[PDB]
């Protein structure tokens, strides 16, 4: 059980690099 | 069980690189 | 069981690169 | 079982590039 | 059980690089 | 400029599932 | 420059799976 | 530069899983 | 620069699993 | 620089499982 929300992010980026992932959530 | 709501991002950006996903979610 | 809802994402950009992927969603 | 709803993304943007995927949704 | 509301963040910056991970969720 | 020479391989065997190559060379 | 010589493998084998690749070689 | 040589390999095997690959070489 | 020479595995064996490589040699 | 010669393994085995790689060489 997870949870985000109303948050917020501001800015020019590089974004994610990921390897290996199970069941997450990515935003970029 | 996963969640997330009314998030906002303000940017340009270089995205996202993922190597192996199971199950998971991506916004770019 | 995954969500998300509502959310806004602002700016041009490099979108996603993803090698391997099982049962999952993508927005680029 | 997986969802997204009301969801906005603005701006240009080179898509998504996928090597395999089995049983996913994309939007590019 | 994980949560996060209504957190910002302001500046352009580097992303992130991870490795392995189970269950997790990432913002860039 | 990439070499391989005077190798062997024994076995029935499944081969090779690639989703993308650029350039590359298989054996199978 | 990449090299492999002389080398021998035995064995019946699953052989492999690749999501994306640039150049590579593949023996299965 | 890399090299391997005259190496040997005695088994039957699962083989390998590879999500995205710069440049490399696999035997199966 | 890299090297390996003259080695023996012996053993049936649950192969490799990898995210993301450069330049890298992988043998299963 | 690097080396590895004549080396043996002998046993059965759960192998390798790697996130993200940067030049190396890998056995299974």
Known sequence: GYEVHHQK???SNKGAI??????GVVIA
Chains 1, 2, 3, 4, 5, 6, 7, 8, 9, 10 share one sequence.
């Open 18 to 23: 990921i390897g290996l992932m199970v069941g």
């Open 9 to 11: 992010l501001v800015g």
